[model samples]
Every structure is written in C-alpha cells, then in structure tokens.
Target: LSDEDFKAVFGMTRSAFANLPLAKQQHLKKEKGL
Candidate 1:
C-alpha cells in the first residue's frame, strides 16, 4: 500500500483497538499469543 493508505489502515486499526473494552483487548492479545 502507499504511504497514505498504510497510514489510513493503521489509524483505523488503532482506533478500532482503542474502541474495544479493556477485557476484550486482553482476550484478543491472548488469542494472538501476544
């Protein structure tokens, strides 16, 4: 992806993660083996 596209995708993903509940985020990280 181009730089702007990459930035947009990253921003959206970051926002989506930020919107998740704390417990949900932790569960996601656990599922990903983070």
Candidate 2:
C-alpha cells in the first residue's frame, strides 16, 4: 500500500483507537491477517 493508504488504515486518531478496546483491536487485526 502507499504511505497514504497505510496512514489511512492504521493511523487512527488517538481518541478513536482508544475507544475501541484492545481485545477488539487484536481480533480485528487477527481477522485481517495482520
């Protein structure tokens, strides 16, 4: 992916990311094969 895409995908704003629990993040990442 291009730098812009990477940033768009993973560079969530702090408040947005923190609103998602760690477990949810891990599950999503795993489901995506990250």
Candidate 3:
C-alpha cells in the first residue's frame, strides 16, 4: 500500500473501519499450514 492509501484508511473512523470488508483479513501473519 502507498502512503496516500494508508492516509485515507487511517483517516476513517473506527466505525467505518469495522464496517470495511477487506480480504486482507483472510491472510494471517503466521499461516498455520506454513
């Protein structure tokens, strides 16, 4: 992600962030299968 993209994401309210449905959440920092 670019800086400008992060700025837009961070600028959102918690409510808005929670309402977001990003597939990024589908991945884990440490994959269990790994």
The TM-score leader among the candidates is 1
Ranking by TM-score: 1, 2, 3
Give all candidates' CA lDDT scores: 0.63, 0.66, 0.45
What number of backbone clashes does candidate 3 have, counting pairs of residues 3 or more apart or in separate chains? Answer: 0
Off by over 4 Å in 3: 1-9, 22-34
**Candidate 1's residue-wise lDDT over 1-34, tens digit each?**
4656634544446557778899987786676555
**Where does candidate 1 have its weakest 10-residue lDDT segment?**
6-15
**Model 2 over residues 7-27: C-alpha lDDT tens digits?**
466676545756788998888
Clashes per prediction?
0, 0, 0
Overall local distance difference test of candidate 2: 0.66
Comparison by lDDT, 2 against 3, better one: 2
lDDT of 1 at 18: 73
Q: Model 3: which ten-residue window has the lowest total lDDT?
A: 25-34
User: What would the per-residue lDDT of candidate 3 be over residues 1-34, giving only the tens digit for each residue?
Assistant: 3656544546544455456665432332123221
**How should the candidates be ordered by lDDT, best one leading?**
2, 1, 3
Alpha carbon lDDT at 22, candidate 1 = 93
